[PDB]
Amino acid sequence: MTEYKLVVVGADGVGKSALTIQLIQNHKVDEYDPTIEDSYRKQVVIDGETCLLDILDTAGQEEYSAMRDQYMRTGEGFLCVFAINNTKSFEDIHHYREQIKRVKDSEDVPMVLVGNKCDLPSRTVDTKQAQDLARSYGIPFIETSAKTRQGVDDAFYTLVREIRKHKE
Numbered sequence: 382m383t384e385y386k387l388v389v390v391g392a393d394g395v396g397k398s399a400l401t402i403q404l405i406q407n408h409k410v411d412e413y414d415p416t417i418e419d420s421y422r423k424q425v426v427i428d429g430e431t432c433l434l435d436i437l438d439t440a441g442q443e444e445y446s447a448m449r450d451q452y453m454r455t456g457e458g459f460l461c462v463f464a465i466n467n468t469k470s471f472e473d474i475h476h477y478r479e480q481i482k483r484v485k486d487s488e489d490v491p492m493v494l495v496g497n498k499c500d501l502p503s504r505t506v507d508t509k510q511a512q513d514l515a516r517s518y519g520i521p522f523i524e525t526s527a528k529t530r531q532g533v534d535d536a537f538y539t540l541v542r543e544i545r546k547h548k549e
């Protein structure tokens with residue numbers, strides 16, 4: 382079965398793990414397991430054909446992570462996540478995008494900008510500012526809530542579409 386490797390990056394605390402687990406848990410009966418894995422698989426249908434997503438969550442750059450760059454280089458597409466009530470995590474998006482280009486040795490890498498925690502009323506990053514940043518990068522932008530499930534499936538599906546566009 383075809384397998385696409387998706388890597389989730391961004392500052393710690395923005396909801397990288399919550400988004401990933403919410404995607405995996407949606408639409409299925411999951412074993413109760415309190416383990417937090419750093420990677421999860423999910424079956425999807427791409428152009429009528431069942432495929433596997435392998436989704437890996439990475440540590441924010443404020444944490445040392447010996448394998449982080451090697452892990453990222455295996456990624457075919459990246460979810461760059463910030464929290465809408467965390468201005469620094471949005472400012473950090475530039476770092477993550479440049480670090481993705483570094484580890485992939487490429488100027489053209491599939492990515493999606495994700496503004497998470499959109500259930501919160503304490504936003505400090507205007508939706509327009511993130512929309513305009515994504516457009517300037519040529520990438521999609523979506524606001525999500527791992528809490529309410531708003532946009533969660535759609536964020537990962539949009540990334541899969543970006544990967545497919547790149548492959549073609």
Ligand SMILES: Nc1nc2c(ncn2[C@@H]2O[C@H](COP(=O)(O)OP(=O)(O)O)[C@@H](O)[C@H]2O)c(=O)[nH]1
Binds near residue numbers: 397398399400500529
């Ligand atoms: N309100 C709200 N809290 C969230 C959301 N996503 C994550 N959180 C919380 O933010 C904290 C960090 O989430 P986590 O997924 O562990 O962050 P990570 O370090 O980016 O993986 C936890 O307390 C989560 O429950 C969201 O969409 N809304």
Ligand SMILES: [Mg+2]
Binds near residue numbers: 393394
């Ligand atoms: Mg955390």
